[PDB]
């Protein structure tokens, strides 16, 4: 019961019932605003359609049709009536806003008969017929009987045979003929299924199509790419239709109370006169700045602005709105907090704080932290930009300096590799089916839409760069080439940006606004977790500290053994057969390594750094090419055979679970003795030459048993205690462990007896909990997402149900034995907002990620506290 | 406080304080028997010596010396007194009996001076001096200043220069000279440390040496090999010395109330007249059957038998005793429940039941279940034995038909591989330092001791075959050859058995006594767990059912794809690029595989069989030799290149965690469809042709997520439902999963939504919990045991603290969602007594192991219930 809600029968609170769009339509209805009345079929009904075999049940059909009767009775027309039909728009609404992804069908309820009854009742044949040519196209697209390709090929050639330039110029005749051509395209590109004439079948098929669409491969990739769970489901709103294609005094448009690209306060957006928004603003026929609407219809612009201001004040955030002007009567068909660009979100957050609309708290909890990745994206080198060959210019849809090769299909944009082969997507317009290539491209180059176009919208959503509405790009896919200015490209290199310019460019790195600093500042005042970085280089350390890192949660020591001028010593060691000989090979590294640590301790200035002992199996240091092995044998007095056999003997079946990490230090404690010396000697020295105290954090990797840790710990403590011969050295130091093995977590109360701190290496922990190597997992992981087996990538987003439990039991149990035990997470999960909230809630002390994710973790840790207190 | 207990101040109950030997000496003291009074230094004091830096503390020293004063005062002599010294025997006692491993020093408290005071007080110079030559040797051995090699080279050449054949023939002079030679060997094979003259230093050094010995590499390997934990510690008993080397009316010996080789009721054992047991019965000078003692000293044999009978009746189990006759006065210096051979343990268990001494329950809980492995050991082929070239004969120390190559060092016996390269250890006598080679050998061939010898004793302990006391084996290690009859062997092949005969032999398999059946019968009446086997072959099934298997807990389906006449279809499939093409390759296997299942269902006759879906990565089916790959390409129309590249593309870094198990069925559900058909069609048919009902158990391997299982389950159910077209088939079937991934266990309440049964694959579960591949782990695992990091092999013995928790949470959580969920363990752990008790206690329903471990699991499941109710 209650599968359907009238707008007035709702509120903004029931967003999961009514979806984003739904509770907003409801809210506004409540606000007493000019919105066409209507009803929402709940997200519940989506779950019902699905978890019930995929059939709109009796109670749903009836509950829908019921509301239809309400509407008729309401606005005195009969649903799909012959003389005066009641037309509706059907548009899907997820609990979460998904701009550029949802479905909208307008003018629903028109048949071969009602289009004439509507024409006579209205007295405007071109109108009724345009609204029919439009409804046939949308239903065939959204309910998916056939694609826009077919449809526009017809509306287009007609314009080009009939000497007409704008479909706005076709006549009541052309349009009605065209309806026939389109209804041909339908039946003729299918079974021979007559285009639903029955308004009621049209409605139900719309409803089904919308529920069905929720499991479309594209919805799934977007949902994963946006952390949206498929437990949600889409609501479907049905509203009484309002028309902007009624004539010269009608129109429609998309407006945003603040620039969604920049954050600049003031109306931003576009419109088209005598057009339906839901398809002709979001595309062709160059739309006009919503500011020009003051010129055309000052009566409406004034009523619109005030209503837009009232919506912003009401939802206390920038509103992305869709309105329609029905012959000088303005209607709002939709609001939603605009989806912004990161610089935008920051800018809007500061302004509302200064403007007194929102508090710092709301400002923090409001930025999608994951989007901060944009702010640290390479900008263009200005001098490379000065000498830049500007082949063109267009609309600055979403900010960014993007440069890369050009490809004409999302598929080939994606197959040239994601955001790694600098791919540039050159399209006319993008569509939901392009979601992956767009998202893989560095920037999008479109040939037609504007700021509210699909490409503008989606790109800004993903922080990708986009120049929309570049009318002069003559594209040829069969040849896969394009014309711009005095040039023709063929999947070659291109460059472009938000300064609108497009050129035939060295990118660098960029400034961080004061809204970034102001936000990060507020972040810091609310977050309780500390944010450390994962940096094994001082350049990275400074970069990380600059962005807010409070220390190093992981300095890997492998580079100190791999580096050319050092690898030979560990190779010497590996092929040595005598502890005294390995010790010797090892000792030679002390000066190199101690050297690396001082430079790190100097970069750090007092900030703690968690140093990690040798992690990888020895095999990684041995050469595996016989050229290189023949070089080594020579610099050792060995025969290629004995080196080749030494290497072979180190080889393992499962390198992720072999002789490595602490295991090597148990068989070769000399590695650990040598590392503790390099570390301890380094620290004491920088402590000497600077007076700044250092409390080294030594982390033994891959521990599964308390006795296994204690063993290596002993060797660490003894050497550390011995090194304190630069004075019996007052220096404190903490010996901790990487919990990256389930046993470590299971027996964390025993491991804590010997470990002063726990650093969760969730990447590897995930790998053992799940049973798969990140490396080999890609060969089946896509199928898993495709099958909805996994909604999130376990390697990017912490699996809280499984791996999350091990982390949470390690903390609780470790703290039974060591109440004051520090715990920090390490890895990709450290820079993931949801992994960070879990960690905040589970009690970790700090988080640690790459230097570029520190701002994300800083923001996420503040949202975690604010969301949790 | 209370680091020392008098014998009377103890009881059999405080066995962990007083050790096996201690509480037994106490018990007997209590029984009012003829044992030299004395005191025990607790196992606690061992823990104290250790966990306190390895120093016998003040409170220990004093508590010991105190009891020494007690003894003096007690048996009116003064400890290490000059004229009448008080001599003591120092012998270590673990909580657990470890025959052949502990330390004993006799005649302790004699110095260069007291040996004469003892000689005058005693009036027997040869006695005092023999007891000194003996004390110098034992202290140097046990307290380890130098080895028996040195010592006997002296006592021996003396006998062979002085025309004396038995050291029993040396005189008061020879012996005293010899003491000098030995005390030379000491100081002269060390620093120049004078042999402790101070009785009190002798005692303390004995005590320390015994505590210290507890961590000796050999104690550790034996402790692991016998599941003894190093948390235990050894107690050290100090008793007033009684002498069997006093003369012609004195002697000593080791007797067992029942044959420990066979179980036959009646005294078994040996003695030597005018000798100290603690070193001259357990070795050279051919000892006499303890039955001949009726001839020599009928007065003593009669008192001895009655006392032996009373000890057996008292401890209600066969007693292994050491007694000494001090000039016609008999003393008991020790009892302990004899360690028996498996056939023995069985035989003694039945007899005590029939004899009315013990109940069935006690009989079951008494057999060391792990020892049942002996009963199913290949016996000799009798006809190969008839035509056997008997190069010799000796004592049937422990039963068995052993055959193998001969090696003269434990090290080389072990390096020729354990019980896998049929190694035969040919020694004069074995020693604690030979523990690993003995244990690796198929049988032991000794040149001197008897039934109570080290080799006899240790071997029977481990169920290894042993022929002791083969006086004619002339051994030459420098040449590594040996003479027997008319032959000389050089690490060649040899064969031997408990029929005593030794020959220059095809072994087969053997009968199982009725005491085995009677025990197994009692087992069944008490055990609640069911015992299934792991068999993928019907030969194995029959063998397993024969031994008591109640079904199959794991039928692996890999052989059905590997077998020559079938591998090409899966290879075809693997190199096919089309679901329809793989399906085809797959379908060809249906007749072969369905064929394998019927034969299994027919062997099983109604017993359930858990069938496991394809487990290994596809790479295992592709050939990796280019000869074989060139063969395949040819039988496919492929170029070696395309096959070679297809194989390369399947290759993984970590094969244990790649694309395998359920993962393959998610990308290739056709594998699972084809397997369900082969299985379901097989079952229905045998159900047809037999009328015996079958309820297939389908097990999906490697599950980590409930949706992942459900996915594959769906495909399984649909095909199973479709196959029921041999009639809509009434056939029931259970879809379950192998919990072998931590996530599976962590999320077991969700996995149970779709799984009807959980089969724990603890081998792989251990591998993921611990972080190591069983394969690559051997390169560091020994070091771990050597370092006491791990006391047990995690792969043979279930780690209850870590892996055990995951099993136990999977059961508790699985049963929250599926109260009636069946749970069984699978693997090596299924046939491990301690893994089986845990499983009984954790609530598993059945256990499953190799067909040869079924009797062990049957017995272990009964001991688990009996130990648990």
From Swiss-Prot, chains A, B:
The active site is at 454 (tele-phosphohistidine intermediate), 826 (proton donor). GO terms for molecular function: ATP binding; kinase activity; metal ion binding; pyruvate, phosphate dikinase activity. Signal peptide: none annotated. Residues 498-528 are annotated as: Linker 2. Residues 1-339 are annotated as: N-terminal. Its cofactor is Mg(2+). Pfam families: PEP-utilizers, PEP-utilizers_C, PPDK_N. Catalyzes the reversible phosphorylation of pyruvate and phosphate. In E.histolytica and C.symbiosus, PPDK functions in the direction of ATP synthesis. This is Pyruvate, phosphate dikinase. It comes from Clostridium symbiosum (Bacteroides symbiosus).
